[PDB]
């Protein structure tokens, strides 16, 4: 009743939903506390992060820095691969990825620079080529500079600066912190007080208003005690702004409008401590003596309730919720509460490899000087136990264990952790993300599924700026760990692999482990011996893939692994529309190529092992449905490749031209055509047969080459093209070209006679 | 090891060890990498028995190129660290990425030399890279001349204030002696570079550079009014070793085309 590709498409749809059901942060950080860690040595194949390279500060910057009379400062523009150094009233930028960078100097400023930041521009203000705004704060004024960070052939942005005539006098309040919103709003704070200022700017000059203005959103008055800021933090997904004070007070501001900022929550350390005391587990790691050293916003895409992480100097991660009084009038919260605490790990870093209650007393992260959190929970903590050497604790969610945990009430904040040692003299200054923000889904459920996106986005990389250079730290995926572990099993026994494989099964489950083996066998992780590793991965896929069984059947873990891998290769495509109507393609062509290559390498792997992999060759009811299921998946793979080739062919022509000369029903069918329908549903095939029948018609009008477009459609997308149609196309070729040559007398009798043949 | 080789007249083997070490990712400072390369260069320039002239020259050449780039990198690092207008925060960062393995000329230009407006070093970089781009080269020459002029002007001003009783801006080391006129400091910059690149470079296209310097002299009154020799631009390039025929040849072109300031009287 239901054909192969439609059966396999059913497996894909159910697999997509399974990946998108990965637990949300609120669900495994429920009210309470946790100390769950599995620590890994930094040199281990199981390390969750590792240093990939380092970039020294240019010598010319050292010359300027040691030529500093009063004040110097370093900072990071990790979004574009740039660092900067300020010396008194002078500023120097440079691309730290470049092996011998040139210094972009800016010395117009008259007074000492106290803060520098790179923010988005205000829309409709600057030319489109301006990608950022550079904010330079001195003791006398704030200065805006236009920035164009266009990528270069080498892979590092080319940076050019533009003047703006936009500037404002600072005033009496120091500026040490500058943050920007998605829409280009610029907020300021510093070490004089807790006031928050905003800089406005516009293109037009007016007689009643300048191009650039500044206002104090705090409206202070009367008696005020000493208190100032330690940092500012933005969350665009909630239109919120957070400040942290030197007294560890957390203030929340809501952007109720494009020019408004309203304080809506103020929570001092006493309030946090009172919440903490009402929890079941109180600890001497958090008292009235403890300081909060850093905040990190948690976006609404990641979690609904938990808004904010706060790091104590004892290494405790405080996770705070925020809630509005009502459900309708963005809606501003009015309350904030400490709900969940992740306590520090216990293992300390060691040169030599050392050998179930809540651990709420560890001093391993005491003192924590700096801290950072990146979605889906990557945590960097600068521990400063000694005044000369920083130690870096880095941890990630144990995505594999969180995904397998059952039932939901057993979910805990499991983590994989490691210690990265920096050499003597390295003082960490800042840590920033160099790759695109992580997101496996568009809502909390599914958001943190690292496993699902292993092959859709590069692993996260982080630039660690020190006083001596920039270190690049990279997140390691399961396939990276699996490949590395197998690389150590190349010189060992049959039982050595089985032992290493059992470690993975106990953490990730059998399906995820076999899917990793399949991926490694197909060359994933090799963008980083390699033939032996891929052959070991093949051996693991065969030997430990399981088998089908009667419970309706339960297919092998080998089958589920193939379905899981294939689904994740096309997850960005499946439910997406093919086109966007001036019609264009929803998915960039470059992305369609890589997806197709991945699908084809998977197909090539199955063909080269059709004889050794169970279920591929034909075989009692169990192995029967195993063969049918595997067959259906392989038919979907070839259909996926044909479908992608068809879309690429389509946009190589002039689709808008083809779309114009088309009937309404077929325009509408093409309007809401998804990749799933193209791959697995007859209407996509029928519509594909219409489009090919239409593109060739147009190709003949351009008349570049018919027989080349023929052999293009004949072979690659065969089984969807028909050989009786190309001969027809060859006939309509001479017919139209007989109408092209129509004025000629002797040339047609050969065109029309051959068209008739 | 290298000391053993050399005393045994095995200079090429030592040059090989030293070069590889200079290119390696071991923890070696830039200055030590400069010493290693400089030694390899010497050791590869002399005969080592049993080894072909071709193999010697190729190593001596790789060491010479890497040594040239290394010296550039060292000039940068030093200048940046000492630069009063660079924030301390940045300097530490510069020292980390420049006081280690030798970087590519692209990086040195883009991330450091161009950002800090060290145009003289930019020019040395265009030389080491065989950079074929007359327009950019001249743009850099124009920036170097103007930058140097403004700096000389500033220093003469400070001096004039000392000799009049006034006070200099906070944190300005006075000049106890008449600093050089701007055209003297500019030509100093041109000499330093010339000696470093040897006039045979593409950063000394006399047909473009001589008119620009002459242009500068006119448009900034670097002439008799201030007690300078009106022919100073010509003296400069002649002593520098530009052949007489080429000079006159260019000057002819200047006179025939009547461009920029070379017009009217």
């Amino acid at each position: 009743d239901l054909p192969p590709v439609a059966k396999a498409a059913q497996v894909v749809n159910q697999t997509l939903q399974l990946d998108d059901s990965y637990p949300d942060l609120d669900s495994y950080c429920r009210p309470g506390a946790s100390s769950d860690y599995e620590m890994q040595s930094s040199d281990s194949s199981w390390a969750p992060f590792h240093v990939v390279r380092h970039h020294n500060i240019p010598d010319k910057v050292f010359e300027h820095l040691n030529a500093g009379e009063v004040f110097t400062k370093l900072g990071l523009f990790a979004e574009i691969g740039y660092a900067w150094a300020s010396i008194d009233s002078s500023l120097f930028l440079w691309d730290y990825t470049h092996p011998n960078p040139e210094l972009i100097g800016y010395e117009e400023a008259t007074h000492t620079i106290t803060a520098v930041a790179l923010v988005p521009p205000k829309p409709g203000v600057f030319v489109k080529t301006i990608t950022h705004v550079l904010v330079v704060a001195t003791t006398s004024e704030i200065i805006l500079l236009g920035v164009s960070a266009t990528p270069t052939p080498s892979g590092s942005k080319s940076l050019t600066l533009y003047s703006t005539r936009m500037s404002v006098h600072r005033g009496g309040s120091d500026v040490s912190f500058i943050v920007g919103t998605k829409d280009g709003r610029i907020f300021l704070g510093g070490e004089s007080d807790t006031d928050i200022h905003e800089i406005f700017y516009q293109q037009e000059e007016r007689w009643f208003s300048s191009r650039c203005g500044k206002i104090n959103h705090s409206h202070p008055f009367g008696s005020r005690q000493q208190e100032w800021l330690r940092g500012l933090y933005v969350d665009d997904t909630r239109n919120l702004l957070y400040s942290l004070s030197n007294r560890s007070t957390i203030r929340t501001y809501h952007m109720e409008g494009p020019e408004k900022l309203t304080k809506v929550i103020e929570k001092d350390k006493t309030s946090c401590l009172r919440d903490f005391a009402h929890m079941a587990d109180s600890s001497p790691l958090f008292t009235d003596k403890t300081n909060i050293v850093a905040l990190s916003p948690i976006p609404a895409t990641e979690a609904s309730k938990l808004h904010l992480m706060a790091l104590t100097d004892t290494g405790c991660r405080l996770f705070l919720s925020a809630t509005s009084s009502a459900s309708y009038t963005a809606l501003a919260p009015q309350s904030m509460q400490l709900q969940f605490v992740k306590f520090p790990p216990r293992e300390s870093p060691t040169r030599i490899r050392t050998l179930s209650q809540l651990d709420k007393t560890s001093r391993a992260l005491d003192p924590s000087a700096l801290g950072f959190r990146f979605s889906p929970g990557y945590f960097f903590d600068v521990v400063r136990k000694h005044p000369n050497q920083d130690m870096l604790f880095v941890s990630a969610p144990d995505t594999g264990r969180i995904k397998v945990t059952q039932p939901a009430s057993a979910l805990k904040y499991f983590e994989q952790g490691t210690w990265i040692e920096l050499e003597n003299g390295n003082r960490t200054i800042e840590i920033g993300l160099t790759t695109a923000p992580f997101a496996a889904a568009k809502q909390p459920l599914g958001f943190g599924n690292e496993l699902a996106v292993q092959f859709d986005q590069v692993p996260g990389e982080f630039a660690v700026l020190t006083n001596t250079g920039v270190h690049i730290v990279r997140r390691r995926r399961l396939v990276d760990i699996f490949a590395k572990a197998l690389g150590n099993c190349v010189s060992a026994s049959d039982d050595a692999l089985e032992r290493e494989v059992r470690k993975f099964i106990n953490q990730y489950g059998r399906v995820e482990t076999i899917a990793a083996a399949l991926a490694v066998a197909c060359g994933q992780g090799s963008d980083l011996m390699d033939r032996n590793t891929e052959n070991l991965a093949r051996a693991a896929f065969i030997e430990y893939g399981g088998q089908p069984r009667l419970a309706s059947v339960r297919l092998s873990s080998r089958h589920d692994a193939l379905a899981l891998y294939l689904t994740r290769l096309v997850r960005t495509l499946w439910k997406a529309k093919v086109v966007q109507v001036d019609i264009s393609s929803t998915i960039p062509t470059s992305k369609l190529v890589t997806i197709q290559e991945n699908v084809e390498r998977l197909r090539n792997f199955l063909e080269a092992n059709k004889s050794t992999i169970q279920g591929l060759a034909p075989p009692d009811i169990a192995n029967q449905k195993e063969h049918q299921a595997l067959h259906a998946l392989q038919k979907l793979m070839e259909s996926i490749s044909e479908g992608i080739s068809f879309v690429l062919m389509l946009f190589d022509e002039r689709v808008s031209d083809i779309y114009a000369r088309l009937d309404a029903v077929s325009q509408q069918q093409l309007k809401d055509l998804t990749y799933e329908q193209l791959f697995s549903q007859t209407p996509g095939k029928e519509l594909a047969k219409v489009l090919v029948k239409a593109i060739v018609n147009r190709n003949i009008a351009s008349g570049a080459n018919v027989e080349t477009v023929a052999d293009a459609l004949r072979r690659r997308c065969g089984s969807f093209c028909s050989p009786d149609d190309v001969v027809t196309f060859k006939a309509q070729e001479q017919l139209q070209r007989a109408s092209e040559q129509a004025h000629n007398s002797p040339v047609l009798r050969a065109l029309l006679a051959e068209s008739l043949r | 090891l290298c000391r053993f080789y050399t005393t045994r007249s095995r200079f090429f083997e030592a040059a090989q060890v030293q070069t590889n070490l200079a290119k390696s990712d071991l923890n070696i400072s830039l200055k030590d990498r400069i010493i290693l390369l400089s030694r390899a260069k010497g050791n590869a320039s002399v005969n080592t028995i049993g080894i072909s002239r071709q193999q010697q020259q190729q190593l001596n050449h790789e060491a010479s190129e890497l040594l040239e780039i290394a010296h550039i990198q060292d000039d940068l690092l030093e200048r940046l660290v000492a630069d009063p207008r660079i924030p301390e925060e940045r300097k530490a960062e510069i020292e980390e990425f420049l006081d280690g393995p030798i970087r590519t000329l692209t990086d040195l230009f883009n991330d450091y030399a161009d950002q800090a407006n060290y145009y003289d070093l930019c020019l040395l970089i265009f030389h080491a890279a065989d950079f074929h781009n007359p327009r950019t080269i001249m743009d850099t020459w124009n920036n170097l001349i103007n930058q140097s002029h403004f700096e000389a002007e500033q220093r003469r001003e400070y001096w004039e204030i000392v000799q009049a009783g006034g006070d200099l801006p906070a944190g300005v080391i006075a000049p106890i002696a008449e600093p050089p006129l701007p055209y003297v400091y500019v030509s100093q910059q041109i000499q330093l570079i010339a000696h470093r690149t040897s006039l045979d470079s593409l950063i000394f296209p006399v047909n473009s550079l001589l008119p620009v310097v002459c242009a500068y002299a006119i448009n900034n009154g670097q002439d008799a009014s201030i007690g300078a020799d009106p022919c100073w631009p010509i003296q400069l390039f002649l002593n520098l070793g530009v052949p007489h025929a080429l000079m006159v040849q260019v000057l002819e072109n200047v006179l025939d085309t009547q461009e920029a300031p070379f017009t009217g009287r």
């Binding site: 117009e108 030319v127 050019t160 003047s163 293109q203 | 145009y119 930019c122 930058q147």
Partner: peptide, 14 residues
Amino acid sequence: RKAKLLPMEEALLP
């Protein structure tokens, strides 16, 4: 080398 600051005219439209 002091960075060349291109003019406001290019920067802001229209």
